[PDB]
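User: These chains co-purify. Model them together.
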Amino acid sequence: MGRVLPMLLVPVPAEAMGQLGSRAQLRTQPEALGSLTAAGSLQVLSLTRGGGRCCLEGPFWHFLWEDSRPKLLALGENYELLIYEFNLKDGRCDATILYSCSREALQKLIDDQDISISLLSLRILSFHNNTSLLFINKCVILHIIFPERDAAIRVLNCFTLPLPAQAVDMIIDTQLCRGILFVLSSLGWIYIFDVVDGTYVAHVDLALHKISSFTSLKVSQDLDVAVIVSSSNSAVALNLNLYFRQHPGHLLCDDPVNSAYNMKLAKFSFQIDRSWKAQLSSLNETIKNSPWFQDILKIMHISEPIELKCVSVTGFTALFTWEVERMGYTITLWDLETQGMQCFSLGTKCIPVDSSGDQQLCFVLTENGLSLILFGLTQEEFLNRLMIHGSASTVDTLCHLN
Amino acid sequence: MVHAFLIHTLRAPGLCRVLYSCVFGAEKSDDPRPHGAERDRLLRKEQILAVARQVESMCRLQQQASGRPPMPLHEAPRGAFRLAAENPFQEPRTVVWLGVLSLGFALVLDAHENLLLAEGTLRLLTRLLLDHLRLLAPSTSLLLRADRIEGILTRFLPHGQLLFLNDQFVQGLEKEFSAAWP
Amino acid sequence: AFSAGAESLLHQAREIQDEELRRFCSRVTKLLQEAPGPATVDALQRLFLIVSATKYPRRLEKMCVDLLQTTLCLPASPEQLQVLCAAILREMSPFNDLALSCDHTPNTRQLSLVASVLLAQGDRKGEIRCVSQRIFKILENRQSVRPLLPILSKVIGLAPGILMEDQTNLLSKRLVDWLRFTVLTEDQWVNMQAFSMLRKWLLHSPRERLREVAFEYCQRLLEQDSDLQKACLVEAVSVLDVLCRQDPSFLYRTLSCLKALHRRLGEDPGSERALVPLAQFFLNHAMDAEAVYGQLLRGLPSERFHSPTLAFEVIHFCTHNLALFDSHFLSLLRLSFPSLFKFLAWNSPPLTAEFVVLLPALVDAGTAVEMLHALLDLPCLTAALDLQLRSTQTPSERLLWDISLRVPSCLEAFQDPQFQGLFRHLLRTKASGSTERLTPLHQVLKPMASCARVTQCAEAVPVLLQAFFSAVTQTADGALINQLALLLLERSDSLYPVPQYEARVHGVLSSQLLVLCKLKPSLVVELSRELLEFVGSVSSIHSRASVFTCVVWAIGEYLSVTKRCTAEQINKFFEALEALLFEVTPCCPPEVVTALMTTLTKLASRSQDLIPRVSLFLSKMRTLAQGAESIRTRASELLTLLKMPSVAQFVFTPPAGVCQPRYHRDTNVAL
Amino acid sequence: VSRPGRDEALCWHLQMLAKVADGDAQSATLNFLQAAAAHCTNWDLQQGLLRVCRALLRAGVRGGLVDLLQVLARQLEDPDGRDHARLYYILLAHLAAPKLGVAL
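Assistant: Joint model of the four components:
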């Protein structure tokens, strides 16, 4: 029983949906909804009334809004990275270009770190506090910083991947999750490095977990569960602590006098204060009672999604996005602890909007507009919880809007 | 088997510190740290000290809750117990005791050893230690004269093994040891 | 005994200064190389004391160590010095500097000393194999061999296979030729050693003549001179059982031997300990359920419960072969539990850490309703056995009992015909039907209920209760649940007044009735009458000050609208609660007041009319209130939070998943 | 909160903890309270502890408390304290900020 709870907290007509792109991403606050058109124009539908569209034209094929858990930063076809700011004041979809970077300057900064490699491809990894991490040439994890006072972009760190060039150039994903920078190689390994120091703090054997071509991997915000989605619409999730311990070979991460000796005799270790009154507590405790990242300071196959990019993964849940032209959008939710899945089919005019923030409920842009898809919440239950939370005005609004 | 023979103090109804702790064997031992001496010695000492504390607890509780002349061959407190793995032994073992005055001599014996033989042998040994050495006032004769204990056990208790000695065989061993010391 | 001079000597041996240690090592050097006389022993004794009494390592000057090793290698040394040096090198172990060798002294007794030196090292440098091989090579010539056999035995104790097959068969033939008289010359001298390790040899590892003589020598230690006879009967039975283990045909032979022995072993006092190995042999290869096993389970413990080592043997046999228990054996051990409780009454310290394992291994379907009472009346069991001793013993032998406390009232009450059947149920050897409350016998045994042994038995009942409940809380159905609830409701304030006993049974029973209620929420619903009478009585809060909180909390929370429930039950329970609150406001503690407020205000928010009743009476109670502060504040959670009905209707009856830490983050995902 | 929480004066610590807890130093307080959860066997400390949780309630702290209150409700001794925690956890998890001050 997982059909829908498809609410809508702001409308958006299909006139703009006929102009937006196929994929989009939303700020945590309602700041924008920018979508990528196949023509290279960056359309921004401000869902913060009426909702006009803004256009940013160029050879842009990669961008990411400021995910401060909108300041759009994009890199063109000539490996020139730009930062343009859009202001949603009073519904005015007006944008301005603030910071621009040229390919010659990027190659110069790469060479100044004694890296004898010409920049052939730059793929983004993050954009936080005006500091961007980029996996340059798929090998050098150069942590740029665009500071205040128009300071030049200087790499505050540049550590070559402690791996041979055989697998260094086969990297796919560069995910920063609270500092444990993971770089996935398409052959089935994840070299968990640390952006602070650059050490190969650990290594994960995705092959030992037993297809191939790991397209992307999702890290829980607590570095607790990681789910890797390949290019074959297959996702597998295993626990970092268990996957580092249960295969620890791959993990590179009179009163006192006898008691402290129990602390240093380590072949065994007593449990010593050997009376016949405190030996009952041991029996009582036995009857009654009967992670990996600490050192580094089923399967989803819908019986073919185009881009099976899971939106976010929590400690006990996992939400994914799948879009198909034949039938529409299929949104999936996986419970990490309960191993349950809820997959709902939607209409053929709807695309995801990656909420680059804290609210990990699938906010799908439907024909009428914004739509937050939930599971298990009845309309009566939801409105009752709002009323038990606030006034009846909110209940009236949420009941009337649909 | 017998892992060890003991002489230890027994409190009256001050830690119980073994006056004589003869460990009749070793244990297999491997830590990634190179095989040391502090670790093994401290382990083989703390095990015996824990056995001594357990026998003290058994003896004291037997003393209060017996009523038998509270505070002599068959008139001394006696009993048995079982130990706990990793606290601090590997293979679990039974513990046999027989306390006289304030000198409770124990035996840590494997579960494949006779209990009644263990109690009889501990009784004969504690008679021999009370008489041959006669420490019923000069208790210094038990620590500065540990060689007498060493001789007695080396004669009667060869290498952690109990013998079914009878009158003729005890006569033979008496002919053996009696004159070896003045 | 224990002289302060002895303590001073030990303290001096422990805290000898490093410079003083170097001086003593130099003295040893200048005194051992010299003419070793009485000064040699007078210094070696002090060296042994200063090395032995120090747990932390004492690696003194090397010269002393090499001097000791060479002295062991020096044949002119006397027996005393050689033994003391062997102790020196068998105590200072284990050292990685083992300059010693395994073929350094020709003397056989000195060879034994060298073996004792070597074996105390460990497998850190492949030592044990070297010592075993060297011993075999030294024994390869004519031997004698009798002195060195204990080293062989200890080696196989610590190393089961390094004795090669050829060497193993050499040892076997040597022992067989060494078998042969009996306890009841050099030949008999080696016979004693052959008998002294037979069981370990068989476990770790002519033959027709072996079966003729040595195989029957196991029983010949007993069958084929009083204390050694007892010490040897057990060895004979254990060796017979070992032969059964190594030879399946020997199981029948040992069973027949035990059956033949049953003429006296079942009728000879002072020989009861030999049946424990017989019981083990029967279990691994079942004895007479009535005579032999009957005495082992219920016959022996009612006559000889005052021997602290026999009881250990019995209960350890019971808990060491529970894995291989059979259905009939399970029924037997489930039948005689009140008698098995006699040992826990008398010999608790060495047997409770053993019942904790045994109790979940004899749980039956309906015995729990009586087993709780059997656990409840255990200190009284000890007191009744004490009276039994005081009134049947000849004054001559009476030392094997307690006759040193207040006799006259209890002894008179023993002969009082008012209590001639209840004692025969408390002291019973069986439980085949529940008995009456022990209140009368509790008033009888006031004088002795504070004995040392009764106080001993009182401390092993809480843990056994926890074991039994945890074995039944996972093995319960509706009838069992209701019976147990009624049992606790009765026994709340009906206990033997042994000091610090009811304060523990109360805690276990109350906090586990909570566990039963959380196992089935409808317990309060099906238990209207009893709980209603209990809450309506002030005396319940005036004598059960720590169980009343539990029942009032359960009633306040488990009056849930969401098929046997009726709308008027809430009103009847509210009537009981209102009466209790009016009357009440060890008496009711500052916990009962707050729990009563909680129950009233959270039970009147499930009734439409009773909200005005709250506004009239619970509001009045708040105003009068406006552990007392908690009483005043608690009711707000269903006065202010139940004034509004929509929110209050559901919180107090939450779903099944408010506990697991991720079940609701999507329930605020509806905006 | 400096001590790990193994003292015998816990019944005296929790009173200050309740009288002072707010939304400034979250993680340290949550860790200390989690450690102290195992050292509460009598009703008095089991009410001081939920007095602390109620103080946090009133302060308005939201995240992580959905687990601190949860663990307190799931791992105490007396039923009354556990029900107290359940009610207060529900109040914090399902209320808007003002209504908690008006309906709790």
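Chain A touches chain B through 22 residues (CB under 8 Å).
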